């Protein structure tokens, strides 16, 4: 009676995947086993960045739990070691760290640092995005339903997507998108909000995995900084080497953010987030606020984060993701060329997707067919999902220990699944 | 070079206790060891509710880490088991749960549920309180420095304290305090905010461990509910049996909150928080919001929380805290009677304090002497701290495994420490 018992305690609205919620009882690496003993390839979960049940992570956490686990008002070496290891993954002026317990807490603090620093309130976000679940983040949310109306201090941008657009038309797309940014900024200024931040997921995953014209992000940053604002890269989806080509998603662009936020993978499942920032921004915020987060930077959270970084580094996972990503993209392009139910190939590294469309010549988004594919792939023993404003972009985002053998299983099942659709 | 290295990464403002920061490298139960090998009694930390390095909590976390640790979009028994165990500690209409990763995330979500439900924004809080570190909580914060001005939607209340007041004057204190509440409410209504919530820590610990006249909390609840608002009991300090006499601090008062928040001890250090509420409030919020917290309710966090409740129940810690609390209170009263540097004895269960005052007959708060006593207690091998708007209320709040042998060591050193003052 597990579903009933859940509904009587945490309630029926807390989301569950699939028509029939799956009960997953164990995992190992990329493999998950449900309560009936069926085994699935995990094509979806990024939180277990270094695999389900990774024993190096388990051991590091357990050993620290046998030692001591206190807040950061007493000195302790584990937090300092972890901060050093994490900050060694950043360049330029990104050289200080605030630890938190979630991605929402990180984005909440980043927006607060920015609001205080800039003396402005205005927020630029995409028109189909999600950055967390606090009050301030609800007021800026466009990609999921919330009761709060969109804040008067918010402008939502239509982030440009070159996918399937003729290469001759990109310059007009870029020029128009940037004029839209100018208009947003001028609007926020006229209203008295000014510009505090541009906040974005570098993969634009919730948006449908957009491929941007070169110069868009750089152009936004320039305009935002001319308005006295800051740039925040939300790395919850693109971070920790997920893209292959760089540790952080913002590296796909010619931009250095003042603020970088993170959560998901960082502790393999342990509740940890962070805000990485400049010396000037951390120092200022600390002079103005007696800021403290009780659980942040505790030794056990730090042990978990350290073990994740150590494991990624020892197993060369980021470089592996880059090579495997390229292979997967070539296969997906073959799939797209031949399937009338596939539009464009999207993403990078081990965050990959395809938009699912009607085969009747309309190229219309086909959410229903997308659902069919998600459910059929589950039947075939692979967990995937979807994103995007039309609910038609398959989203594949496995643990970063997913290798070539796993990719061939997933892609072969995807092909067969596509071949089973009608018309 | 540990201090320097910390300052180069997480910076020099992140707070540290004591003139000379202590490096604590290990602990066991109520005992901590610093990098020089000096051993201290923990009289201060409530996060390790069931003791430093508790092996049942460590084992429950590890076994689940070796099993699976996914978000709640897949069914998993651990979260359901935990939710059942936690909700079994609540009566009346408190029968649903939202899990979070901290006490701030819980209070943030509680305010949000209340704002949406009530259609109001006004907040009543104490005038020297701290409920967390988000933007919305910064705007209501009175007991610590933040850059955000106190919100136009906030009214700060002087919570009444009967400590040292003649009994004959308590009813007048109560009456005036409640008129102050009426005035706050009418101001919020005139200004168009209305009343969304009254939010409080039942021990009023940050405020200096106030002893309230009976009927104040009941009276606030009545007035807030007549204005269409809700009551939130923040249990981060008073929860999980700390008070001895009840699982939750709000049980000290004749009040059933609509919202109860928690954090700190819940997972012995593991990052967990919660909002406990009614079926109607959870249902309404879920209909109106696609609310999801990625780490909340993961199997490992639920394993941790379960191990804490199981251990507390198995070792009878709440009932022990009630009996030991009575003994400590008697000892502290003997100490207060004898020392001209001690005013009132405060708190309940294993949250206890004393105000430290000048001995010159003025009874003026003495923050400098309080700091001397904290530093001297540290030299003698006991960790304590202080709270209150005058920074003069010693705060003792040990792991809930602290027993009588520990209380005698602490209280003996405190006596000797008080005897050393001018
Ligand atoms: C971009 C971005 N930024 C911030 C957050 C918030 O993190 P959280 O507080 O939930 O730890 C998410 C979450 N995303 C919740 C949905 O997770 P998924 O379906 O497995 O991708 C986020 O996607
Ligand atoms: C009443 C109350 N409500 C919420 C919070 C916030 O919890 P968090 O987000 O830091 O886990 C605190 C914390 N308080 C941080 C100070 O910790 P202490 O000195 O060891 O008592 C709180 O005191
Ligand atoms: Na760019
Ligand atoms: Na195609
Ligand atoms: Na009362």
Positive or negative, the Cα torsion across B280, B283, B287, B290?
A: positive
Give the list of residues 6+ apart from residue A92 with CB closer than 8 angstroms, or none: A256
**Contact of B176 with B165, CB cutoff 8 Å:** no
Q: Could you give the CA distance from residue A219 to residue B231 in angstroms, rounded to a whole number? A: 48
- Which residue range is the domain that position A244 belongs to? 54-315
Q: What is the DSSP string of A230-258?
A: EEEEE-TTTTTTTTSSSSSGGGGSS---S
Give me A357's structure tokens: 């469309």
- Give one word for A92, left, alpha or beta, with left for phi > 0 and alpha for psi -120 to 50: left
Nearest-CA neighbor of A278 among B1, B11, B147, B138?
A: B11
- This structure's resolution (Å) is 1.9
Residues 6+ apart with CB under 8 A from A259: A110, A113, A114, A197, A230, A231, A232, A233, A275, A276, A277, A281
C-alpha to C-alpha distance for A301 and B395, rounded to whole angstroms? 27
d(CA A29, CA A56): 12
Strand boundaries in B29-83, DSSP class E: 31-34, 39-42
User: d(Cα B130, Cα B201) in Å, to the nearest integer?
Assistant: 9
- Nearest CA among A72, A40, A46 for reference residue A349: A46
Q: Residue A23, SS3?
A: strand
A315, A344, A377 - which closes a domain: A315
Pocket of ligand 2 (CB under 6 A): A 292-295; B 102-104, 107, 130-133, 201, 234, 236-237, 263
Among all bound ligands, the one having the nearest atom to the CA of A213 is: 3
- Report strand pairing: A259-262 vs A230-234: parallel
**What's the gap in Å between the CA of B130 and the closest CA on chain A?**
11
**Measured between CB atoms, does A82 come within 8 Å of chain B?**
no
Which residues are registered as beta bridge partners of A230? A197
How many other CB atoms sit within 10 Å of the CB of residue A119?
9
Question: How far is the centre of ligand 5, averaged over its atoms, from the C-alpha of B203 (Å)?
Answer: 13
Last residue within a domain, chosen from A315, A339, A368: A315
Residue A132's H or E segment, with its range, is: none
Query: Breaks in chain B at C–N > 2.5 Å: after which residues?
Result: none
- A272 and A228 assigned to the same domain: yes
CA angle B65, B66, B70 (to 5 degrees): 50
Residues sharing a CB contact under 8 Å with residue B69, sequence separation 6 or more, in sequence order: A47, A48, A52, A53, A268, A269, B298, B299, B300
Total domain count for chain B?
A: 2
CA distance A319 to chain B (A): 25
Beta-sheet strands, E only, within B144-286: 154-157, 197-200, 230-234, 259-262, 273-277
User: What residues does ligand 1 touch, defined as CB less than 6 Å away?
Assistant: A 102-104, 107, 130-133, 201, 234, 236-237, 263; B 292-295
User: Is-contact B367 B390, C-beta < 8 A?
Assistant: yes
Contact A101, A273 (CB under 8 A): yes
**Last-in-domain residue among B275, B298, B315:** B315
Residue positions counted in chain A = 423
- Contact between B101 and A271 using a beta-carbon 8 Å cutoff: yes
**In chain B, which residue's Cα lies nearest the Cα of A144?**
B290
- What is the interface size between A and B, counted as CB pairs within 8 Å? 314
Are the C-beta atoms of residues A178 and A214 closer than 8 Å to each other?
no
CA–CA–CA angle A289, A293, A296 (5° rounding): 135
A228 C-alpha vs ligand 4 centroid, how far in Å?
Answer: 44
Q: Is the same domain home to A222 and A165?
A: yes
Q: Return contacts of B334-337, CB within 8 angstroms, 24+ apart.
A: B335/B411, B335/B414, B335/B415, B335/B418
The terminus-to-terminus CA distance of chain A in angstroms comes to 41
Tokens of A281: 């921004």
Assess whether B179 and B102 both reside in one domain: yes
Question: What was the experiment behind these coordinates?
Answer: X-ray
Place of tokens 């940053």: A221
Q: Among A54, A6, A60, which residue's Cα sits nearest to residue A29?
A: A54
Phi, psi at B177, each rounded to 5°: -60, -45
Complete DSSP assignment for B165-197: --GGGHHHHHHHHHHHHHHHHHHHHHTT----E
Q: Are A289 and A299 in contact (CB under 8 A)?
A: no
> Which domain CATH number covers A94?
3.40.640.10
The verdict on a CB contact (< 8 Å) between B45 and A70 is yes
Q: Which of B199, B125, B123 is nearest to B159 (CA)?
A: B125
Q: Would the CB atoms of B134 and A112 count as touching at under 8 Å?
A: yes
Say if CB A222 and CB A268 are below 8 A apart: no
Q: Which residues of A are annotated as a binding site for pyridoxal 5'-phosphate?
A: 103-104, 237, 294
How would you classify the pairing of strands A31-34 and A24-28? antiparallel
Based on the fold, state whether residues B245 and B362 are members of the same structural domain.
no
Distance CA B87, CA B246 (A): 15
Domain identity same for A267 and A349:
no
B13 touches chain A (CB under 8 A): yes
Atom of ligand 2 nearest to the CA of B263: 11
As a whole number of angstroms, the distance between CA A413 and CA B257 comes to: 53
**B316 CA: distance to closest CA in chain A (Å):** 23
Q: How far apart are CA A276 and CA B254, in angstroms?
A: 46
Q: What stretch of H or E contains A372?
A: helix A367-379
DSSP letter string, B317-364: HHHHHHHHHHHHHHHHHHHHHH-TTEEEEEEETTEEEEEEB-SSSS--
The answer to whether the Cβ–Cβ distance between A75 and B133 falls below 8 Å is no
A294 and B263 in contact by Cβ < 8 A? yes
Give yes or no: residues A205 and A75 share one domain: yes
Rounded Cα distance between A174 and A220, Å, is: 11
Shortest-distance Cα residue to atom 4 of ligand 2: B131
Based on the domain organization, do B203 and B186 belong to the same domain?
A: yes
Instruction: Please tell me whether residues A309 and A328 are part of one structural domain.
Output: no
Phi, psi of A351, rounded to the nearest 5 degrees: -125, 105
Q: Provide the 3-class DSSP secondary structure of residue B296.
A: coil
Q: Which ligand is nearest to the CA of B219?
A: 5
**Are A235 and A375 in a shared domain?**
no
Name the β-bridge partners of A274: A99, A262
B129 with B64, same domain? Answer: yes
Mark whether B191 and B306 lie in a shared domain.
Answer: yes
Query: How far, CA to CA in Å, does B248 sit from each of A83, A255, A272, B243, B309?
Result: 36, 50, 28, 8, 13
Q: Are residues B324 and B271 in the same domain?
A: no
CATH number (domain holding residue A15): 3.90.1150.10
Neighbours of B29 (CB within 10 A): 17
């Amino acid at each position: 009676d597990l579903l009933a018992r859940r509904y009587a305690t945490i309630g029926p609205h807390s989301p569950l995947f699939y028509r029939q919620p799956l009960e997953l009882v164990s995992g190992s690496g990329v493999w998950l086993t449900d309560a009936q003993g069926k085994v699935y390839l995990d094509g979806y979960n990024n939180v277990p960045h270094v695999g389900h049940a990774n024993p190096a992570v388990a051991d590091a956490i357990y050993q620290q739990l046998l030692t001591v686990n206190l807040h950061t008002r007493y000195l302790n070496s584990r937090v300092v070691e972890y901060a050093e290891a994490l900050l060694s993954k950043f360049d330029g002026a990104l050289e200080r760290l605030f630890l938190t317990n979630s991605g929402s807490e990180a984005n909440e603090l980043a927006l607060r640092i920015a609001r205080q620093h800039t003396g402005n309130t205005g927020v630029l976000v995409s028109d189909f995005s999600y950055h967390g679940n606090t009050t301030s983040l609800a007021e800026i949310t466009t990609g999921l339903t919330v009761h709060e109306p969109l804040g008067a201090h918010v402008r939502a941008l239509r982030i440009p997507d070159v996918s399937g657009i003729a290469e001759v038309d990109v310059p007009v797309l870029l020029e128009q998108s940037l004029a839209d940014v100018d208009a947003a900024i001028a609007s926020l200024q006229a209203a008295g909000h000014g510009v505090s931040v541009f906040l974005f997921d570098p993969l634009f995953s919730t948006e449908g995995l957009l491929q941007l014209p070169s110069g868009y992000i750089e152009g936004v940053a320039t305009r935002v900084r001319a308005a006295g604002g800051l740039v925040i890269s939300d790395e919850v989806q693109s971070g920790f080497g997920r893209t292959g080509s760089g540790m952080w998603g913002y590296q796909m662009f010619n931009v250095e953010p003042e603020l970088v936020t993170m959560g998901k993978p960082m502790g393999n499942g342990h509740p940890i987030g962070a805000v990485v920032t400049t010396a000037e921004l951390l120092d200022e915020f600390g002079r103005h606020n007696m800021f403290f987060n009780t659980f942040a930077g505790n030794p056990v959270s730090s042990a978990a984060g350290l073990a994740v970084l150590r494991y990624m580094d020892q197993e060369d996972l980021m470089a592996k993701a880059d090579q495997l990503g390229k292979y997967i993209r070539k296969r997906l392009e073959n799939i797209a060329q031949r399937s009338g139910n596939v539009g464009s190939v999207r993403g990078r590294g081990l965050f990959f997707g395809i938009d699912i469309i009607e085969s009747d010549g309309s190229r219309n988004p086909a959410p229903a067919l997308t659902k069919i594919l998600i459910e059929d792939m589950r039947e075939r023993g692979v967990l995937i999902s979807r994103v995007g404003p039309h609910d038609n972009v398959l989203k594949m985002r496995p643990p970063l220990v997913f290798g070539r053998e796993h990719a061939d299983i997933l892609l072969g099942q995807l092909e067969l699944s596509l071949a089973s659709l009608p018309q």
